[PDB]
Chain length 205, copies 4
Amino acid sequence: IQFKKYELPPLPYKIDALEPYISKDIIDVHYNGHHKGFVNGANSLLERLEKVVKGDLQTGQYDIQGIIRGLTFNINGHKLHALYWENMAPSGKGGGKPGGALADLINKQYGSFDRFKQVFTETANSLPGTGWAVLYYDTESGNLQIMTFENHFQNHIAEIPIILILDEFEHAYYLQYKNKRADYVNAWWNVVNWDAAEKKLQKYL
Amino acid sequence: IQFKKYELPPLPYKIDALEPYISKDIIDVHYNGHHKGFVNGANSLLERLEKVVKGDLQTGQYDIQGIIRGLTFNINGHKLHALYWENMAPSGKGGGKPGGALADLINKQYGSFDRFKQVFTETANSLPGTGWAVLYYDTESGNLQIMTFENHFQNHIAEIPIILILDEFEHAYYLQYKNKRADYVNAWWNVVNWDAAEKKLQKYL
Amino acid sequence: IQFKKYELPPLPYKIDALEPYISKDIIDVHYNGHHKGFVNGANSLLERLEKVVKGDLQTGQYDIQGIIRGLTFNINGHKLHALYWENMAPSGKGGGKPGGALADLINKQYGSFDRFKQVFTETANSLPGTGWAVLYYDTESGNLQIMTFENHFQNHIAEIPIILILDEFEHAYYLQYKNKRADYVNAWWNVVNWDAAEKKLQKYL
Amino acid sequence: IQFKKYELPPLPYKIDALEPYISKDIIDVHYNGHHKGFVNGANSLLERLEKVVKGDLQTGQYDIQGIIRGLTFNINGHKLHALYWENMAPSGKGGGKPGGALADLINKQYGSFDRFKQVFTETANSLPGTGWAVLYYDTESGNLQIMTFENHFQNHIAEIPIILILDEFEHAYYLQYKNKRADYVNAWWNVVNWDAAEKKLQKYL
Ligand SMILES: [Fe+3]
Ligand SMILES: [Fe+3]
Ligand SMILES: [Fe+3]
Ligand SMILES: [Fe+3]
């Protein structure tokens, strides 16, 4: 008996494909260092949890909250980065405005893409500390719900899909933007994979 | 322009259907008081967010983190309780053991339902403070991942479905069990809607 | 080598001394059940941490984040309740308005005690989930800073003293007020130990 | 009526005084960028809270949880960095081992400074995400309690003094160590201001 392990997905493009918005130096360590670290961290914790389940680690030889909380940290660390990479694309394929159903929903709920961009940027910059900014598609209400995560595992909304995702941990921009997170946020719009976003949304319509 | 509002789902059974495991007094206020409060809280915050989007509330007339964080609190409060009600059933329909694919997965990953129950109960009782204990079906790895939430919005794992959900806020058991949360957890197994659980799991296989 | 253990302080009054604002039934289990549970939880975790330090628990036989986070949960659980009991007093000795330096500071920063009461009550009721509402005396700025804690260990401000403390976990009022936390908050003002508060403030002036 | 504003304390040394353990480039932006940002953020929120108190911002023109939570974030951001700067010193004045009462307490509770260093380093590296690692002096138990903070405001222990403090946000080491936080932690021991630590501890004995 055991749990299936996680696997680092391949990057959808070269590490420099996002320049000049996000330097290849950032992407390189962000993917090969940070993301890989989450896959590894999640897997080692799964191996440890398997031992708890099998009884190879008996009472007093583990602290369950440390394992469980470490798992939500690493698993989300992996899942969110995997979404992050696929949510971006080199300028041209990336950037611009959304079309199809996504654009329609955005207009109905925010008036226009231009307004949405403002509100999202504003909400992303209001995030106290490290975390993420995402646009959910609530399959229950049909609302494109904006949300900011603190760390990788706090503030998520249960079961619904992430359509737009922006990494706000400092390692996602520091080497290039230093402490100017807001400039990184502005630059990020230029590599958003709107087509992938529309494609994902379609799956829930 | 606006967001669609949330609606309190009807209870799947009478308020006393879960006795003697969970008194009708608890269920009554838990549903009509607590759950309804989340729907209302979420909706009023949505109305407020609409005003921010439309500009009826201008700069300096709102604190976005208060709205956004209040939304994750109330929206999850609503969604999780909605899952909670459907995840239980009067003794007979509720309780017992799971069958089908769910039982198979449980045996492959935990050895047996008996072991799973132990590990879940142990993990649920380790929760520091109020929150939830859930069993996820990770569509990525195929793992039935156990997790404890702190409050309604901390520790969730992105996008994956909740198969089993246990409410651990004090209002879910205090009136009947006082501070003996562990006794409430033991009693809860008797009303778990395993059929609904198998049904939900099937949807992702 | 070892760490000193914590001790449950004696209650400053009889368990019914706070009626009719907080029933003796609540106080009884709140002190003998909940508070005692924190002292015990903190001590057992300290014993476990001692074993990690001494090496009796070797690598792979513990998950440090579980121990450390369990310690902040239980230690604060103990400390905050200890402050809570001393921050209240039977009607007469408790309730009313503050005098001395505390009253003056309140007037300078909030205009009046009445205004302060309003803002504090408003802030306490805005707390999403379980936790606490406190009035700090920031020794750095001299500000009587209001704050809400989520659970027992989130949102504290480093090193400064708590002058006013209100428990907002459901077990502090459920048996008597059920889900009407706001009514409990209003009733609480009637047992606030303003003299003890003035006394504590004096120590930092 | 109003609240007193916070002030950025002057750096205790030149921005390059901590090299080669922490580059002057990091210190420069860490102090002039990050720390200053917290003082400013705290003050603007205080100004806003004053308006809520005075009534210049009426109902519906603010979201109290956003103000209150933003205050704990920024105030701690300021206080913790202020402690951080004073807790370090150029090599010579900094680094080495503690003496006096601090050393004795460390020996009684951890066996030796060497063991303490190991446990602290281990605990600091276990921190999931950004935050801090601190050594508290619990005035209640007399325990030198280790703790890791998540972000600037989560996991603190009420009212007790911080003797040792290590910043674990990525901006404290990224420019020099990139994602190798553990190497930064090892290097940090070389600039710990043990004398200041002993001095602060003395105040509570
Ligand atoms: Fe990242
Ligand atoms: Fe509930
Ligand atoms: Fe309590
Ligand atoms: Fe810092």
